[PDB]
Chain length 287, copies 2
């Protein structure tokens, strides 16, 4: 119950000393993720001063840890708030690291080449340009993109060798700080980055070596924000949260990150709606 | 007086750096708006890069703002002209949003039939030009505009039934056809299935509750690329008030004429002969 989660919420805030106010006003509502992101911030600066991230900003990491915490704390209280998904993430069973050279966009269909990979619905659109039916996926160098996909998968395996399911799925944020209506993409941008130093040079550390690229998520349309987190670090956020919970509680509750299902809802927007400009006048026109 | 507004303008022109050529040529005369439009595009680019138009020619947008500023400059300087209206617009009290399923043309006559047209079109020279291939499609647009306006003016004691409509395009600023811009309903595709419990911005909720908006175009799409949606035209006016209220604090008086149906708006079906210039003193040779 809400009260049940409230107790669990209280504790974490006391232990990791959350500002006297935030805890006093935290009532467990969907928009209340500052105190949660705060308990994580201290626990990090206290128990993990040596966390080196890769293509991730500290704000994004502490932010994400908050979401996954809210998830657990909610899963623990058996609370579901309509029109709200705690994680701000979904699991995309991508099929990019399967057929050599082939990638498949968010639609679950192949990507039409233009070596560049474009979502098939941008057929008319000139390469890196999107239609209102697009999912907003594009890759300049298609090979790199796959290397990044192979990497996250390699990493995922190293961390979970005896998994019965999961190595094909992709943990990915569905909303950046912007959408937490606007034109352009509707989900954080997925961009592959390369690790030149790895090229030369612990199974998970070898993942980056064997596949010198990394999936990085930024803002939807870099409205734009400084959101940035690489996939593997995003996994480590989910993980660190699990441990933080396990340090404070005997059993870890089920937290189901929704599996990604395509929807028009995530379609690239090309047309805007009017937003009124501000006027101090009471009446519209003079008579 | 002329000196005052002439000074208020060169002040606004220098500030937003309009080409010295236009700066000189300007004189607060009836159809001088290029310079003003310029002051407007610059001001927009400088302090409003995030502006976004829905079915509106960018050019059409600064043109309208130019007109509204000209209106202001003129009133401010108290300089009127025998046959000119700076705004180039009128306040049509449309009754198309009041009675469910009812639309009415400029004449003030219900529109008759799927499609709905002017009563004198069951175009005839006694028509106003108004026609709608789909009734609902059309009314959905008229509803939205009322919604947007109510939002932007919640305490408005009067004006939600009116419509800021333009009277001329870059064609008539006689000639055959519709004697004013063409009003054509355009549906808002993405809004159709959007949760109306999104955020606290009501004006957007208007487009959400009524996914389709009125777009004004050329009198006869000689024809021009005049394109501007109802809400953007209202914003043209609003933003000019902003621009002005910044530099002069108190905004002057400026009444946009109210629409009164009259023959000069009837569909023109027959031309009136125009004499071709002849460089002769006498027409014939005997
Ligand atoms: Zn796609
Ligand atoms: Zn963003
Ligand atoms: Zn009529
Ligand atoms: Zn025209």
């Amino acid at each position: 119950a809400w009260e049940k989660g409230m107790e669990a919420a209280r504790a974490l805030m006391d232990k990791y000393h959350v500002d006297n106010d935030l805890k006093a006003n935290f009532k467990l509502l969907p928009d209340q993720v500052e105190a949660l992101a705060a308990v994580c911030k201290t626990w990090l600066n206290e128990e993990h001063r040596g966390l080196q991230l890769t293509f991730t900003s500290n704000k994004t990491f502490v932010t994400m840890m908050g979401r996954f915490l809210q998830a657990y704390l909610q899963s623990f209280a058996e609370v579901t708030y309509k029109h709200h998904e705690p994680t701000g993430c979904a699991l995309w069973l991508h099929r990019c690291a399967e057929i050599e050279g082939e990638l498949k966009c968010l639609h679950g269909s192949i990507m039409i080449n233009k070596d560049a990979r474009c979502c098939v619905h941008d057929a008319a659109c000139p390469a890196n340009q999107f239609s209102g039916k697009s999912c907003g996926m594009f890759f300049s160098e298609g090979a790199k993109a796959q290397v990044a996909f192979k990497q996250i998968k390699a990493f995922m395996q190293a961390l979970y060798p005896n998994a019965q399911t999961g190595h094909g799925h992709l943990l990915m944020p569905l909303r950046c700080e912007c959408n937490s209506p606007f034109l352009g993409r509707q989900l954080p941008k997925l961009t592959p980055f390369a690790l030149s130093n790895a090229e030369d040079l612990d199974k998970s550390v070898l993942a980056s070596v064997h596949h010198p690229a990394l999936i990085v998520f930024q803002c939807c349309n870099p409205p734009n924000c400084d959101f940035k987190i690489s996939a593997p670090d995003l996994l480590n956020a989910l993980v660190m949260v699990r441990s933080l919970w396990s340090e404070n509680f005997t059993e870890l509750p089920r937290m189901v990150v929704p599996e990604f299902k395509w929807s028009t809802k995530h379609q690239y927007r090309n047309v805007s709606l009017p937003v009124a400009h501000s006027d101090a006048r009471q009446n519209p026109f003079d008579f």
